[PDB]
Amino acid sequence: KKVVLGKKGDTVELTCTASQKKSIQFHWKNSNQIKILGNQGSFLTKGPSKLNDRADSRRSLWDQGNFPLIIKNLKIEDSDTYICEVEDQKEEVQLLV
């Protein structure tokens, strides 16, 4: 139950993190359980959400466990809750602008 505040437009870096340093598969979903952003092996993938063109991630940090989510062009309608599922640690971070 983390708290993240933005203004508008800026890049927020939500973060889930494992303890392995070996690029394990994660995902990122929202409150309606639609995929935001996902890892598939060594490639990135999106999901058919309404953040599909705006979401991003830092590719070089996956090899150290850190699996961020970087969102551009913060509107008002993305003020929701987001869920990172690494293997079990379904951490929820909520966002507001």
């Binding site: 940090l61 090899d63 150290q64």
Partner: protein, 95 residues
């Protein structure tokens, strides 16, 4: 009154992981890049393979937790790195 027996020749299983050795019918002359890799790190195929059908046995498998899929994944990283040598890599180091 009952005394402990010992039998040799019993069909007993034991869940455990090991290192599986590869086998394929490489040619040892062809410069196709898999027939090169399957000569340094393989063995000729089984000429007369042994296969036994087991009666009455039930057995629980699992696909998503197999430990030989990560042994196929290793020997194909090791294939392509000695097979498709690239002109420019860009591997993040992250000190």
């Amino acid at each position: 009154n009952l005394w402990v027996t010992v039998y040799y020749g019993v069909p007993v299983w034991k869940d455990a992981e090991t290192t599986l050795f590869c086998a394929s019918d490489a040619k040892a002359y062809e410069t196709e890049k898999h027939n090169v890799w399957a000569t340094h790190a393989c063995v000729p195929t089984d000429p007369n393979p042994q296969e036994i059908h087991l009666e009455n046995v039930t057995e629980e498998f699992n696909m998503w937790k197999n430990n030989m899929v990560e042994q196929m994944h290793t020997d194909i990283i090791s294939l392509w790195d000695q097979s498709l040598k690239p002109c420019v890599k860009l591997t993040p180091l992250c000190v």
